Amino acid sequence: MENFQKVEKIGEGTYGVVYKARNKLTGEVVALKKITAIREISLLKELNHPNIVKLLDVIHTENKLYLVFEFLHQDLKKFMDASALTGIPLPLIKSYLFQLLQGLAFCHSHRVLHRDLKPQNLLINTEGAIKLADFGLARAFGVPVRTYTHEVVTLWYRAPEILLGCKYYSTAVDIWSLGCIFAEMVTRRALFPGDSEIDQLFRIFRTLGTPDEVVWPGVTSMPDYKPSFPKWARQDFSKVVPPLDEDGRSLLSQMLHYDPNKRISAKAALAHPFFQDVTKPVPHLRL
Ligand SMILES: Fc1ccccc1-c1cn2ccnc2c(NCc2cccnc2)n1
Prior knowledge:
Binding site for Mg(2+): 121, 134
InterPro entries: CDK, Kinase-like_dom_sf, Prot_kinase_dom, Protein_kinase_ATP_BS, Ser/Thr_kinase_AS
Order of helices and strands: EEEHEEEHHEEHHHHHHH
Family: Belongs to the protein kinase superfamily. CMGC Ser/Thr protein kinase family. CDC2/CDKX subfamily.
CATH class of the largest domain: Mainly Alpha
GO biological process, one term: meiotic cell cycle
Catalytic activity: L-seryl-[protein] + ATP = O-phospho-L-seryl-[protein] + ADP + H(+); L-threonyl-[protein] + ATP = O-phospho-L-threonyl-[protein] + ADP + H(+)
CATH superfamily of the largest domain: Transferase(Phosphotransferase) domain 1
CATH architecture of the largest domain: Orthogonal Bundle
Oligomer: monomer
Bound molecules: ligand SC9
């Protein structure tokens, strides 16, 4: 750590504080996150891709763990809050979604899941790029109910299989989270802002219909499934994400399929017609 000068506190992450810091040597500006785990994290150093925030180094000393990351200037949560009045233009939403799917496709091809995607871990730059932060940390350290600062870990983007107690969820969980984020960028409101596990599940059910054996073979056997769940009818996506076009609604619908085995993969999503006219606009960032 004596190699880094702290510039400012960025925030409190899931596992520890995150600081903007300067390498007293290279003068490089980085993000420093103050946190079997060592081996898992160490593997992440080679999982490099333009849409994945680079893990520069791991420092383990005095039994304390610091992760040194590539620094980006803003996160998607802040960008969305800042774009509230007018919304993020569709072409930028499309570019972001396309880039995030590329990041997922890459990680998923290596059998590495993120597991806790949310706007706070999607970082953006002035060039129009967006990158996934904290990839792989959930498997390395787990996902707590509350952060080290006691802040509640959001449930809003959690896939239904996780909520229903699946022990061995798949890469499909990240596709669900990203679909939730896609909807939120379009409508300027979180899709399923649950404030407890059952509220999160019931919010999903009220919009997508209570899952049954027809749409999700095996659902009724899942550990936390209860036959006493209320049976709500599915809503049309035209009501859920106006004014998204049919291509976007079609893709969203596939990213939010209940059955994880049938939910679209990141690779398949990249080929969806919605991306026919994708471009890479520059966001307006006031740093
Ligand atoms: F530059 C980075 C590299 C790796 C992780 C986060 C950042 C990073 C850099 N940032 C610069 C401005 N805002 C952020 C930001 N916000 C997300 C956030 C909020 C609270 C706690 N943790 C993250 N994260």
